[PDB]
Coordinates of all heavy atoms in Angstrom, one line a residue:
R1 N 166.1 -138.1 -112.3 CA 165.2 -138.0 -111.1 C 165.8 -138.9 -110.0 O 165.6 -138.6 -108.8 CB 163.8 -138.3 -111.4 CG 163.5 -139.8 -111.4 CD 162.1 -140.1 -112.0 NE 162.1 -141.4 -112.5 CZ 161.0 -141.9 -113.1 NH1 160.0 -141.1 -113.3 NH2 161.0 -143.2 -113.6
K2 N 166.4 -140.0 -110.4 CA 166.9 -140.9 -109.4 C 168.4 -140.6 -109.1 O 168.8 -140.6 -107.9 CB 166.8 -142.4 -109.9 CG 167.4 -143.4 -109.1 CD 166.6 -143.7 -107.8 CE 167.2 -144.8 -107.0 NZ 166.4 -145.0 -105.7
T3 N 169.2 -140.4 -110.1 CA 170.7 -140.3 -109.9 C 171.1 -138.9 -109.5 O 172.2 -138.8 -108.9 CB 171.4 -140.7 -111.2 OG1 171.2 -139.8 -112.2 CG2 171.0 -142.1 -111.6
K4 N 170.4 -137.9 -110.0 CA 170.6 -136.5 -109.5 C 172.1 -136.0 -109.7 O 172.6 -135.2 -108.9 CB 170.2 -136.4 -108.1 CG 168.8 -136.8 -107.8 CD 168.5 -136.9 -106.3 CE 167.1 -137.3 -106.0 NZ 166.9 -137.5 -104.5
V5 N 172.7 -136.3 -110.9 CA 174.0 -135.8 -111.2 C 173.9 -135.4 -112.7 O 173.6 -136.2 -113.5 CB 175.1 -136.8 -111.1 CG1 176.5 -136.2 -111.5 CG2 175.2 -137.3 -109.6
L6 N 174.1 -134.1 -112.9 CA 174.0 -133.5 -114.2 C 175.3 -132.8 -114.6 O 175.9 -132.1 -113.7 CB 172.9 -132.4 -114.2 CG 172.6 -131.6 -115.5 CD1 172.0 -132.4 -116.6 CD2 171.7 -130.4 -115.2
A7 N 175.8 -132.9 -115.8 CA 177.0 -132.2 -116.2 C 176.7 -131.4 -117.4 O 175.9 -131.8 -118.3 CB 178.1 -133.2 -116.5
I8 N 177.3 -130.2 -117.5 CA 177.0 -129.3 -118.6 C 178.2 -128.8 -119.3 O 179.2 -128.5 -118.6 CB 176.2 -128.0 -118.0 CG1 175.0 -128.4 -117.3 CG2 175.9 -127.0 -119.2 CD1 174.3 -127.3 -116.5
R9 N 178.1 -128.8 -120.6 CA 179.2 -128.3 -121.5 C 179.2 -126.7 -121.3 O 178.3 -126.1 -121.9 CB 179.0 -128.7 -122.9 CG 180.0 -128.2 -123.9 CD 179.5 -128.2 -125.3 NE 179.1 -129.5 -125.8 CZ 179.9 -130.4 -126.4 NH1 181.2 -130.2 -126.5 NH2 179.4 -131.6 -126.8
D10 N 180.2 -126.2 -120.6 CA 180.1 -124.8 -120.2 C 180.9 -123.9 -121.2 O 182.0 -124.2 -121.7 CB 180.7 -124.6 -118.8 CG 180.5 -123.2 -118.3 OD1 179.4 -122.8 -118.3 OD2 181.5 -122.6 -117.8
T11 N 180.3 -122.7 -121.5 CA 181.0 -121.8 -122.5 C 181.7 -120.6 -121.8 O 182.2 -119.7 -122.5 CB 179.9 -121.2 -123.5 OG1 179.0 -120.4 -122.8 CG2 179.2 -122.3 -124.2
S12 N 181.7 -120.6 -120.5 CA 182.4 -119.5 -119.8 C 183.8 -120.0 -119.4 O 184.0 -121.2 -119.3 CB 181.6 -119.1 -118.5 OG 182.3 -118.3 -117.6
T13 N 184.7 -119.0 -119.2 CA 186.1 -119.4 -118.7 C 186.3 -118.6 -117.4 O 187.4 -118.6 -116.9 CB 187.2 -119.1 -119.7 OG1 187.3 -117.7 -120.0 CG2 187.1 -119.9 -121.0
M14 N 185.3 -117.9 -116.9 CA 185.4 -117.2 -115.7 C 185.4 -118.2 -114.5 O 184.6 -119.1 -114.4 CB 184.3 -116.2 -115.5 CG 184.5 -115.0 -116.5 SD 183.0 -113.7 -116.3 CE 183.0 -113.6 -114.3
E15 N 186.3 -118.0 -113.6 CA 186.5 -118.9 -112.4 C 185.2 -119.0 -111.6 O 184.7 -118.1 -111.2 CB 187.7 -118.4 -111.6 CG 188.0 -119.3 -110.5 CD 189.4 -118.9 -109.8 OE1 189.8 -117.8 -110.0 OE2 190.0 -119.8 -109.3
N16 N 184.8 -120.3 -111.5 CA 183.6 -120.6 -110.6 C 182.3 -120.0 -111.0 O 181.4 -120.0 -110.3 CB 184.0 -120.3 -109.1 CG 185.0 -121.2 -108.5 OD1 184.9 -122.4 -108.6 ND2 186.1 -120.5 -107.9
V17 N 182.3 -119.4 -112.2 CA 181.2 -118.7 -112.7 C 180.8 -119.3 -114.1 O 181.4 -119.0 -115.1 CB 181.4 -117.2 -112.8 CG1 180.3 -116.5 -113.6 CG2 181.6 -116.6 -111.4
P18 N 179.7 -120.1 -114.2 CA 179.3 -120.8 -115.4 C 178.6 -119.8 -116.4 O 178.1 -118.7 -116.0 CB 178.4 -121.9 -114.9 CG 177.9 -121.4 -113.6 CD 178.9 -120.5 -113.0
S19 N 178.5 -120.3 -117.6 CA 177.7 -119.6 -118.6 C 176.3 -119.4 -118.2 O 175.7 -120.2 -117.5 CB 177.7 -120.4 -119.9 OG 176.8 -119.9 -120.8
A20 N 175.7 -118.2 -118.6 CA 174.3 -118.0 -118.3 C 173.4 -119.0 -119.0 O 172.2 -119.1 -118.7 CB 173.9 -116.6 -118.8
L21 N 173.9 -119.8 -120.0 CA 173.1 -120.9 -120.6 C 172.7 -121.9 -119.5 O 171.7 -122.6 -119.7 CB 174.0 -121.6 -121.7 CG 174.3 -120.8 -123.0 CD1 175.1 -121.7 -123.9 CD2 173.0 -120.3 -123.7
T22 N 173.5 -122.0 -118.5 CA 173.2 -122.9 -117.4 C 171.7 -122.7 -116.9 O 171.0 -123.6 -116.6 CB 174.1 -122.6 -116.1 OG1 175.5 -122.8 -116.6 CG2 173.8 -123.6 -115.0
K23 N 171.3 -121.4 -116.9 CA 169.9 -121.1 -116.5 C 168.9 -121.9 -117.4 O 167.9 -122.4 -116.8 CB 169.6 -119.6 -116.7 CG 170.4 -118.7 -115.8 CD 170.5 -117.3 -116.4 CE 171.1 -116.2 -115.5 NZ 170.9 -114.9 -116.1
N24 N 169.1 -122.0 -118.7 CA 168.3 -122.7 -119.6 C 168.2 -124.1 -119.2 O 167.1 -124.7 -119.1 CB 168.8 -122.6 -121.0 CG 168.8 -121.2 -121.6 OD1 168.8 -120.2 -120.8 ND2 168.9 -121.1 -122.9
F25 N 169.3 -124.8 -119.0 CA 169.3 -126.2 -118.6 C 168.6 -126.4 -117.3 O 167.9 -127.4 -117.1 CB 170.7 -126.7 -118.6 CG 171.5 -126.5 -119.9 CD1 172.7 -125.8 -120.0 CD2 170.9 -127.0 -121.1 CE1 173.3 -125.6 -121.2 CE2 171.6 -126.8 -122.3 CZ 172.8 -126.1 -122.4
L26 N 168.9 -125.6 -116.3 CA 168.2 -125.7 -115.0 C 166.7 -125.5 -115.0 O 166.0 -126.1 -114.3 CB 168.9 -124.8 -113.9 CG 170.4 -125.0 -113.6 CD1 170.9 -123.9 -112.7 CD2 170.6 -126.4 -113.1
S27 N 166.3 -124.6 -115.9 CA 164.8 -124.4 -116.1 C 164.2 -125.7 -116.6 O 163.1 -126.1 -116.2 CB 164.5 -123.2 -117.0 OG 165.0 -122.0 -116.4
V28 N 164.8 -126.3 -117.6 CA 164.3 -127.5 -118.2 C 164.3 -128.6 -117.1 O 163.3 -129.3 -117.0 CB 165.1 -127.9 -119.4 CG1 164.6 -129.3 -119.9 CG2 164.9 -126.9 -120.6
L29 N 165.4 -128.7 -116.4 CA 165.5 -129.7 -115.3 C 164.3 -129.6 -114.3 O 163.7 -130.6 -113.9 CB 166.8 -129.6 -114.6 CG 167.1 -130.5 -113.4 CD1 167.1 -132.0 -113.8 CD2 168.4 -130.1 -112.8
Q30 N 164.0 -128.4 -113.9 CA 162.9 -128.2 -112.9 C 161.6 -128.6 -113.5 O 160.7 -129.1 -112.8 CB 162.8 -126.7 -112.5 CG 164.0 -126.3 -111.7 CD 164.0 -124.8 -111.4 OE1 163.3 -124.4 -110.4 NE2 164.7 -124.0 -112.2
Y31 N 161.4 -128.3 -114.8 CA 160.1 -128.7 -115.5 C 160.1 -130.2 -115.5 O 159.0 -130.8 -115.3 CB 160.1 -128.1 -116.9 CG 159.0 -128.7 -117.8 CD1 157.7 -128.1 -117.8 CD2 159.3 -129.7 -118.6 CE1 156.7 -128.6 -118.7 CE2 158.3 -130.2 -119.5 CZ 157.1 -129.7 -119.5 OH 156.1 -130.2 -120.4
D32 N 161.2 -130.8 -115.9 CA 161.3 -132.3 -116.0 C 161.1 -133.0 -114.7 O 160.5 -134.1 -114.7 CB 162.6 -132.7 -116.7 CG 162.6 -132.5 -118.2 OD1 161.5 -132.3 -118.7 OD2 163.6 -132.5 -118.8
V33 N 161.7 -132.5 -113.6 CA 161.7 -133.2 -112.3 C 161.3 -132.2 -111.2 O 162.1 -131.6 -110.5 CB 163.1 -133.7 -112.0 CG1 163.0 -134.7 -110.8 CG2 163.7 -134.3 -113.2
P34 N 160.0 -131.9 -111.1 CA 159.5 -130.8 -110.3 C 159.8 -131.0 -108.8 O 159.9 -130.0 -108.1 CB 158.0 -130.9 -110.4 CG 157.8 -131.5 -111.8 CD 158.9 -132.5 -112.0
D35 N 160.0 -132.2 -108.4 CA 160.3 -132.5 -107.0 C 161.8 -132.4 -106.6 O 162.2 -132.6 -105.5 CB 159.8 -133.8 -106.5 CG 158.2 -133.8 -106.5 OD1 157.6 -132.8 -106.4 OD2 157.6 -134.9 -106.6
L36 N 162.6 -132.2 -107.7 CA 164.1 -132.2 -107.4 C 164.5 -130.9 -106.7 O 164.2 -129.8 -107.2 CB 164.9 -132.4 -108.7 CG 166.4 -132.6 -108.6 CD1 166.7 -133.8 -107.7 CD2 167.1 -132.7 -110.0
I37 N 165.2 -131.1 -105.6 CA 165.7 -129.9 -104.8 C 167.2 -129.9 -104.7 O 167.9 -129.0 -105.1 CB 165.0 -129.9 -103.4 CG1 163.5 -129.7 -103.6 CG2 165.7 -128.8 -102.6 CD1 162.8 -129.8 -102.2
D38 N 167.7 -131.1 -104.3 CA 169.2 -131.2 -104.1 C 169.7 -132.2 -105.2 O 169.2 -133.2 -105.4 CB 169.5 -131.8 -102.7 CG 168.9 -131.0 -101.6 OD1 169.3 -129.8 -101.5 OD2 168.1 -131.4 -100.9
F39 N 170.8 -131.7 -105.8 CA 171.5 -132.6 -106.8 C 172.9 -132.2 -107.0 O 173.4 -131.2 -106.3 CB 170.7 -132.4 -108.1 CG 170.7 -131.1 -108.7 CD1 171.5 -130.7 -109.8 CD2 169.9 -130.1 -108.2 CE1 171.5 -129.5 -110.4 CE2 169.9 -128.8 -108.8 CZ 170.7 -128.5 -109.9
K40 N 173.7 -132.9 -107.8 CA 175.0 -132.5 -108.1 C 175.1 -132.0 -109.5 O 174.5 -132.5 -110.4 CB 176.0 -133.7 -108.0 CG 175.9 -134.5 -106.7 CD 176.4 -133.7 -105.6 CE 176.6 -134.5 -104.3 NZ 175.3 -134.7 -103.6
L41 N 175.9 -130.9 -109.6 CA 176.0 -130.2 -110.9 C 177.5 -130.1 -111.3 O 178.3 -129.5 -110.5 CB 175.4 -128.8 -110.8 CG 175.5 -127.9 -112.0 CD1 174.9 -128.6 -113.2 CD2 174.8 -126.5 -111.7
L42 N 177.9 -130.6 -112.4 CA 179.2 -130.5 -112.9 C 179.3 -129.5 -114.1 O 178.5 -129.6 -115.0 CB 179.7 -131.8 -113.4 CG 180.3 -132.7 -112.4 CD1 179.4 -132.9 -111.2 CD2 180.8 -134.1 -113.0
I43 N 180.2 -128.5 -113.9 CA 180.4 -127.5 -114.9 C 181.7 -127.9 -115.7 O 182.8 -127.8 -115.1 CB 180.5 -126.1 -114.3 CG1 179.3 -125.8 -113.5 CG2 180.7 -125.0 -115.4 CD1 178.0 -125.8 -114.3
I44 N 181.5 -128.3 -116.9 CA 182.7 -129.0 -117.6 C 183.3 -128.1 -118.6 O 182.5 -127.5 -119.5 CB 182.2 -130.3 -118.3 CG1 181.6 -131.3 -117.3 CG2 183.4 -131.0 -119.0 CD1 182.6 -131.7 -116.2
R45 N 184.6 -127.9 -118.6 CA 185.3 -127.1 -119.5 C 186.5 -127.9 -120.0 O 186.9 -128.9 -119.4 CB 185.8 -125.8 -118.8 CG 184.7 -125.0 -118.3 CD 185.2 -123.8 -117.5 NE 184.1 -123.0 -117.0 CZ 184.3 -121.9 -116.2 NH1 185.4 -121.6 -115.8 NH2 183.2 -121.2 -115.9
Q46 N 187.0 -127.6 -121.2 CA 188.1 -128.3 -121.8 C 189.4 -127.8 -121.3 O 190.4 -128.5 -121.4 CB 188.0 -128.2 -123.3 CG 186.8 -128.9 -123.9 CD 186.9 -130.4 -123.8 OE1 187.9 -131.0 -123.5 NE2 185.7 -131.1 -123.9
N47 N 189.4 -126.7 -120.7 CA 190.6 -126.2 -120.0 C 190.8 -126.9 -118.7 O 190.4 -128.1 -118.5 CB 190.7 -124.7 -119.9 CG 189.5 -124.2 -119.0 OD1 188.9 -124.9 -118.2 ND2 189.1 -122.9 -119.2

């Protein structure tokens, strides 16, 4: 809620297009921090 930087272990290899699992994490984030609007999101791949 304070630092607003989240990184996700991504299962997609499509350019600039993350896994649909991202939706799950973002839904939980909104529940956890209802006032959060702007943040940084890192989509992390091993490639």
Side-chain angles (χ1 to χ4, degrees):
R1 82 189 157 188
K2 176 73 176 176
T3 66
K4 305 170 180 172
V5 178
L6 173 72
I8 304 169
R9 181 199 300 271
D10 190 51
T11 65
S12 168
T13 63
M14 289 179 46
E15 186 165 24
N16 291 310
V17 171
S19 170
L21 292 180
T22 302
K23 294 156 176 190
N24 298 18
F25 306 121
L26 297 177
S27 294
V28 172
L29 179 61
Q30 292 173 84
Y31 169 87
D32 281 345
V33 194
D35 291 337
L36 185 60
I37 295 172
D38 301 300
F39 62 105
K40 307 291 191 280
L41 176 56
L42 276 53
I43 303 303
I44 303 297
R45 301 176 177 172
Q46 294 291 344
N47 62 25

